[PDB]
Amino acid sequence: MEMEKEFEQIDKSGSWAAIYQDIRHEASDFPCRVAKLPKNKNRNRYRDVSPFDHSRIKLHQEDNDYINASLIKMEEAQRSYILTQGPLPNTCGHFWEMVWEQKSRGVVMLNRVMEKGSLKCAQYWPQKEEKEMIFEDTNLKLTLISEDIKSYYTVRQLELENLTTQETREILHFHYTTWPDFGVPESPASFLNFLFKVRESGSLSPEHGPVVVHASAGIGRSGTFCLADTCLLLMDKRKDPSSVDIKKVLLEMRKFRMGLIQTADQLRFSYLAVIEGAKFIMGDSSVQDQWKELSHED
Amino acid sequence: TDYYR
């Protein structure tokens, strides 16, 4: 019990690799039949990362309803997230169809299009406001409205238009640019400053559909974002913050999508992020301003 | 196909 005393115990013993390997062994295993179907081979970026049949997002089309995406429904925390892979050149239309149908207002991107000299995600959004994107297959139009660039992250305002229904919606795009694959952010302050920017925007509100969170596979960096956010919500509605066990919350999350959190250091980071973030949730308003200064966003 | 891990 209690995360802060548990953190110091594991760091002194140097057993982060053992604690993480135990979570992998205890992790749920459910079928991924639709994902392994031959017609869906080119819809998957990686052969080892597939959504479970029970929690997969279904597209609203009679042809093929598949997309490598999962709905993580956290009952007690009262929040849902959609974790998906970085879209492929042939799945960008499917990605935006999912955003429309699920009524999402925000998209959280934790990777870069090109990392370590390799293509990790397609350029699914327009880089220029005069060069809008039309997805002919799903009959959707996407235009860049504005962008607010900071040192380690970018916030974009996009307009998604359904051409069949003639309706328009504003989508907020939160892009973390300095988080390496299988790595961790620069500091808990830089991560939390980003997380609270997403919270204050109104994208995570239950009035809207689930927030779309992705990276390259949508399991490592994405699992870290969602684990830290869910743990902070729980210690605000329980009235006993010390009862929150990060390992039990991660195992509950892994019931909806395989491999959430990829390394031992990513789990260690989730602990640091929640411990530091608990200060604001507890009632100390001033630490949010301290995170902005230590993140060096200017 | 490729593999992530």
Curated annotation (Swiss-Prot), chain A:
PTM-bearing positions, type Phosphoserine: 50, 242-243
Reaction it catalyzes: O-phospho-L-tyrosyl-[protein] + H2O = L-tyrosyl-[protein] + phosphate
Disulphides: none
Enzyme class: hydrolase
Tissue expression profile of the protein: Expressed in keratinocytes (at protein level).
Stated consequence of mutating residue 50 to A/D: No phosphorylation
MF term (GO), any: receptor tyrosine kinase binding
Tyrosine-protein phosphatase domain ranges (all copies): 3-277
Protein name stated in the entry: Tyrosine-protein phosphatase non-receptor type 1
Organism lineage string: Eukaryota, Metazoa, Chordata, Craniata, Vertebrata
